[PDB]
Amino acid sequence: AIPTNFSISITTEVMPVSMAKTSVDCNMYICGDSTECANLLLQYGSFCTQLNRALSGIAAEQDRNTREVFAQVKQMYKTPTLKYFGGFNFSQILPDPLKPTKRSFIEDLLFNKVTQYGECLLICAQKFNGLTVLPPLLTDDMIAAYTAALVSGTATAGWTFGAGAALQIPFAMQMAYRFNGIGVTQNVLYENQKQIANQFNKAISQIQESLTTTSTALGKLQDVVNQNAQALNTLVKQLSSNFGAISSVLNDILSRLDPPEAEVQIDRLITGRLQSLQTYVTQQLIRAAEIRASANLAATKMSECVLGQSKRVDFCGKGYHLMSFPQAAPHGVVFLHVTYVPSQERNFTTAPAICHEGKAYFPREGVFVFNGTSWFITQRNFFSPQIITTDNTFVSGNCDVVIGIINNTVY
């Protein structure tokens, strides 16, 4: 069963590569600005020395994951003027320079379906809780610039951009060599170059209306935000735990009770909050080891899938991948998948070889397909009647070593 008529469609693949880096000052988390807590704190030991070595060790690794995914590019190539490459409409994917966004039309809809602690966003405000979320190294404009130079440069240079210097190539010359990857001839592109381009132009139009209407295709990026929210609020609500003291307030225990009633219940709420601080530090340290996994699925699907073309099955696109499109997104990467999906097969009769001159005749490629009328050589990805000649088949051994040889002639 061999096809003749396929489809090209687009599949969205979504990954996160970084989560929100935080930091914690102990003396306002633990002590709550009291003096005698810090007097009690220095008797535990300098344990907040190590508990800002850890949340710096994570926060320095959310810079690498944002940088190891996107900053594979050596040269920031400009957005070209015409965005219409032999019928290929790259308008919605490269950013429109008319907007004051520096964002494509895809990326604007991605931010609008995703859309307690101190932060300086400019208005800088502090919280009573000692929780700060420092901003990343690469801002989202730099993230939307590496996106744009990965679709500008690959539209004009193709796999050469990942191979070496970004050598020019026409993009119709580009896609044809990407048919040569999947064992599919140049005539499949060039003969069909109108509706090849016009399915792909409407396949982008599907992803528009699929993302204007609904959401939850970005469920992974939502849950990265949700695990930020819980682990801060669990760290928030354990401030209000009594831990065997008469209250969870270090200044009531300071001021209202006796000084012998104080140090009994100061020493309770520190040891309670200290090892509730360490549980947070540990559970960030585990959750930042899944991101370091799923930022290496993105630093290989932006090495292998975006620059090259991948010879790996169900890896960056169901079916046979052709090209990949990076996007920016809040905390992560959204890929698009130009996939080769064959369709509309019919039944054909195969046979191992030809019996002519009493000798067996071995094909280099494919099978021998009986038309009902004629024998010929084709490949199993599209119907292609190439006739059995003197060099697309070779010889070893006599007939009937194969079971079911054809009484045919090598023409």
Partner: protein, 137 residues
């Protein structure tokens, strides 16, 4: 209603007990400190970063001696520049771009040029363009 609380559970707003003026209670400013040095073999000067703070209160409290910690021999040199990371104090703002050597955050890196410690915005890489030439390779 006597007072207000935030989305957390500490009070940040109060109706005044004496004159009933509705107030806000933000906490005092605080944060971390970095130190940006180029190396002892390189030099003996440093420039410090004060994290997650407003340059209005930080540059004030240096001259008014309100910081814990406080240094023996230190002064700003009147170089205070607000990033989103905080008030970088001690380095010289430069309007050009380079490659990142010591990161700060929000697209700002710092290094050691002509020598002194300078700060700037990152350059993402070399700038270039490729023609889309319809028949050329």
């Amino acid at each position: 209603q006597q007072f207000g609380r935030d989305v957390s559970d500490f009070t940040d707003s109060v109706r005044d007990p004496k004159t009933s003026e509705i107030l806000d209670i933000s906490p005092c400013a605080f944060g971390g400190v970095s130190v940006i040095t180029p190396g002892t073999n390189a030099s003996s000067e440093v420039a410090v970063l004060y994290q997650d703070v407003n340059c209005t209160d930080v540059s004030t409290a240096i001259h008014a001696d309100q910081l814990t910690p406080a240094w023996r021999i230190y002064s700003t040199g009147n170089n205070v520049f607000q990033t989103q990371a905080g008030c970088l104090i001690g380095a010289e703002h430069v309007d050009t771009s380079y490659e990142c050597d010591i990161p700060i955050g929000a697209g700002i890196c710092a290094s050691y040029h002509t020598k002194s410690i300078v700060a700037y915005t990152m350059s993402l890489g070399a700038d270039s363009s490729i023609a889309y030439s319809n028949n050329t390779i």
